[PDB]
Structure 1
Amino acid sequence: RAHAQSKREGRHSGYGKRKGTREARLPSQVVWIRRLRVLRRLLAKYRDAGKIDKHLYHVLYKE
């Protein structure tokens, strides 16, 4: 528990301790899918609440 509590703080985290590739530790695809879903459903609620119009929504979706 005490080691888990220091890992929350950002301790025992550094280059010496790590023994796996960045992908092995946190996959790049997961980082994309978290990110891309978050950018998606931001643009969903802006469209339906009506800050943004539907024409600009369609451009930003593909960007």
Structure 2
Amino acid sequence: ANLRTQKRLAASVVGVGKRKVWLDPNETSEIAQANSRNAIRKLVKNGTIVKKAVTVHSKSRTRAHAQSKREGRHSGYGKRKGTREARLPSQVVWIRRLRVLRRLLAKYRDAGKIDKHLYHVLYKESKGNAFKHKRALVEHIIQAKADAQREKALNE
């Protein structure tokens, strides 16, 4: 009983690797009759030939580790390898910050929250790194509005 043929077939027919195929060891006489891709298909549906289950790879350990990770778990120096830059490029950090600063400055000019002349300055004042983050901008804005209102109330 040499089954190397029928095992090569079943693999192609059941549409899976040779290593996942299973031939019933007690039907050995039976399977030896197969010899044809058609024959085999009886044997698959019949149940005497079977597809083994994919061996299990669970991600559960990593899920758990990434879950804790996003609680800010192991960021400690000892857990770092690449440089600060290699982790999170400065250029990306910059680009993110400006975009936010500009979409802000945009939305304001179009809500009439600021005039054009004032805008044009904070665009230049922004590109030149005068604002750490989005709140710091709106602060200087609030200070510039209350600024031209102490020049207006004393010009009244």
TM above 0.5, one fold? yes
Q: CA deviation at 1:13?
A: 1.0
Name the counterpart of 1:47. 109
* Residues 18-57 of structure 1: per-residue CA shift (max 9 Å, x gap): 0010110000000000000000010001001101000000
Equivalent-residue separation in structure 2 for 1:48 and 1:61 (angstroms): 14
Whose helix proportion is higher, 1 or 2?
Answer: 1
Residue aligned with 2:67, SS: helix
- Paired residue total: 63
Moved over 4 A (4+): none
Equivalent-residue separation in structure 2 for 1:30 and 1:58 (angstroms): 25
Equivalent-residue separation in structure 1 for 2:107 and 2:72 (angstroms): 34
Name the counterpart of 2:154. none
User: TM-score, normalised on structure 1?
Assistant: 0.97
Q: Where do 5+ consecutive residues of structure 1 fail to align?
A: none
User: TM-score, normalised on structure 2?
Assistant: 0.40
- Identical counterparts, % of pairs: 100
Q: CA deviation at 1:12?
A: 1.3
Equivalent-residue separation in structure 2 for 1:15 and 1:45 (angstroms): 40
Equivalent-residue separation in structure 2 for 1:42 and 1:29 (angstroms): 20
